[PDB]
Design a protein around this ligand. Structure first.
Ligand code: HEM
Ligand SMILES: *[C@@H]1O[C@H](CO)[C@@H](O)[C@H](O)[C@H]1NC(C)=O
Length: 439
């Protein structure tokens, strides 16, 4: 297979990787006028994977991709079943299954009023705003914007880090079917793990759904002073290398919860102290598989974030099925000294989370329910793994093994990541947008 890179929406396969991103959630008011606008809009603005891998001199000043919810497709008379079990009912109907406190969800996510999302990525706000205004102008009264969520990479040396302080976007699957760089320890999977209708996809897809993907969007609010206070209050006293100062023990506890230090250094490789050079080196920072720690937790807890969401050798060998692409962006202001000192969140900040897969139930949803929320996953371990401390939702939120020298000790972790809403979208191929959606 040769993937048609010019026909695949770029955020799916390559990722926008822009400093700013805006998600414009909309409802369709006038299907005919929307379709008319779509036919002029798509060829001019919708950014392919081929454009994203091009030299920056050949790229537009902002990228745009577009996805539709089930109700958006129905509003447009696009009635063929896409073959996914969760997509038709929408994410609000699935939120309880995910473990969400529904009382924290907010409009307009609390139902299926949202018909779709334009995602706009750019390296500065001006261009982001111009391309957002271009959507408003092009589509006019054919849509109503029901929400816009805007994110930004964190400043300075925190660029690429999420709000708890951890480098994000290190580990992604690589799909066959195109020419790209594969790093040591990176999973290589058939393209149909990500792209509907391609090899590896077992879902029943209409022919027009070829080279689309499903997005799981989640709006997470993060409680950063609370996270930091918890790590200080539960600082690990010592590890194999020796005693830790409280500050060292708090940093170590955060790394034990994630499975990586803030620098990106994976604890499986750097189990006692950060190695910032390792974290920054993509030739090394993914080259582990837990094979050195399958039946003990000294090198890595069984329930650490990255281990729960990608179990690697905990599954017994490579497995294609449950990999997914992520293109998330932080949002909100930096956490002040006063906020950190008080231990109490005073400002809205978090993660606009985006995960792509051909089968929602095998990617995002499997990682969430079967793995993160599952106290007995990974399976067949000598100590109960417990609930993933970052995004596991089961209560009590008890996780074992965080202290490598007292692995039977359990930690009951307050929830620091609050789901505020989300939706399941389908992003068609670029040709499908005009030949099918806008027909
Ligand atoms: C605000 C919430 C979240 C934060 C702050 C967060 C943060 C992180 C960080 C720091 C990493 C390590 C960097 C990397 O390996 O790329 C990571 C990895 C990852 N996360 Fe999350 N995450 C969040 C939510 C989620 C959710 C909800 C899921 C899916 C249910 C998820 C799935 C993954 C996956 C698949 C990886 C890569 C694991 C690997 O291949 O080793 N994350 N995340
Ligand atoms: C390590 O910490 C313990 C207290 O937990 C203390 O008794 C001991 O003296 C420390 N060891 C070293 C080498 O500093």
């Amino acid at each position: 297979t040769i993937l048609p890179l010019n026909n695949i929406q770029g955020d799916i396969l390559v990722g926008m990787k822009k400093q700013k991103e805006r998600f414009v959630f909309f409802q369709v008011n006038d299907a005919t006028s929307f379709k008319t606008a779509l036919k002029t809009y798509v060829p001019e603005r919708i950014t392919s994977a081929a454009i994203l891998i091009s030299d920056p001199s050949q790229q537009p000043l902002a990228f745009v991709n577009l996805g539709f919810s089930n109700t958006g497709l129905q509003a447009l008379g696009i009635t063929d079943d896409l073959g996914d079990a969760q997509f038709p009912d929408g994410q609000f109907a699935d939120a309880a299954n995910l473990g969400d406190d529904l009382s924290q969800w907010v409009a307009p996510f609390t139902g299926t009023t949202i018909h779709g999302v334009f995602l706009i990525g750019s390296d500065q706000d001006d261009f982001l705003d111009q391309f957002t205004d271009d959507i408003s102008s092009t589509f006019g009264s054919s849509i109503t914007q029901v929400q816009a969520l805007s994110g930004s990479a964190r400043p300075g040396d925190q660029a690429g880090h999420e709000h708890f302080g951890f480098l994000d976007g290190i580990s992604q699957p690589s799909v066959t079917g195109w020419e790209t760089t594969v790093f040591p320890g990176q999973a290589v999977v058939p393209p149909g793990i990500i792209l509907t209708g391609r090899d590896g996809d077992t879902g029943t897809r209409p022919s027009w759904a070829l080279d689309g993907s499903f997005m799981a969007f989640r709006h997470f609010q993060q409680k950063v002073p609370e996270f930091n206070a918890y790590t200080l209050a539960n600082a690990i006293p010592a590890n194999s290398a020796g005693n830790l100062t409280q500050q060292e023990g708090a940093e170590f506890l955060g790394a034990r919860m994630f499975g990586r230090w803030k620098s990106g250094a994976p604890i499986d490789l750097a189990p006692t102290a950060d190695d910032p050079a390792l974290g920054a080196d993509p030739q090394r920072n993914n080259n582990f598989d837990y094979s050195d720690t399958l039946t003990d937790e000294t090198r890595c807890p069984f329930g650490a974030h990255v281990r729960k969401t990608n179990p690697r050798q905990d599954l017994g060998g490579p497995v294609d099925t449950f990999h997914a692409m992520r293109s998330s962006i932080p949002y909100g202001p930096e956490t002040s000294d006063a906020e950190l000192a008080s231990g109490v969140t005073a400002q809205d900040r978090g993660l606009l989370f985006v995960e792509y897969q051909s089968i929602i139930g095998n990617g995002f949803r499997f990682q969430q329910i079967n793995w993160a929320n599952n106290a007995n996953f990974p399976f067949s371990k000598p100590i109960t793994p417990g609930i993933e401390p970052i995004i596991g939702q089961t209560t009590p939120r008890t996780v074992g093994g965080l202290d490598p020298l007292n692995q039977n000790e359990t930690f009951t972790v307050p929830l620091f990541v609050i789901p505020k809403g989300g939706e399941y979208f389908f992003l068609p191929s670029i040709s499908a947008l005009t030949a099918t959606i806008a027909a």
